[PDB]
Design a protein around this ligand. Structure first.
Ligand SMILES: [Cu+2]
Length: 128
């Protein structure tokens, strides 16, 4: 898949990838999130949130005080460069973003913002 990637978050607290490479040529980038499993998003919800590694913690910390109401994401978080909605099992969501929003050399992390999920459900995103 050029300029896109398919990612699954399961009931086992696992993303099927821990590293994503965004080709420097890509103009846009699309991440396809699905959620195999049986648990509903209010106990096992999963989302794909993109930020710098530097800002992950506060994004996470801010998200969990945001409630299921706001997908456990601070509304209009200027630290989030891209994000999917929060989904439960059997659900799916995609998000597309501008590669121009990524600086070379700066590090980025992707992660779920459901309470206590980002330590396990995370990975690397890098501009190549
Ligand atoms: Cu999650």
């Amino acid at each position: 898949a050029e300029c896109s990637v398919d990612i699954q978050g399961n009931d086992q607290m696992q993303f099927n990838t821990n590293a994503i490479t965004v080709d420097k040529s890509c103009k846009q980038f699309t991440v396809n999130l699905s959620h195999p499993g049986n648990l509903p998003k209010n106990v096992m919800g999963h989302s794909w949130v993109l930020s710098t590694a530097a800002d992950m913690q506060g994004v996470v910390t801010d998200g969990m005080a945001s409630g299921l109401d706001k997908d456990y994401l601070k509304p209009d978080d200027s630290r989030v460069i891209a994000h999917t909605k929060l989904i439960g099992s059997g659900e799916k969501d995609s998000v597309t973003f501008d590669v121009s929003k990524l600086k070379e050399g700066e590090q980025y992390m992707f992660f779920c913002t459901f309470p206590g999920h980002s330590a396990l459900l995370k990975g690397t995103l890098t501009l190549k």
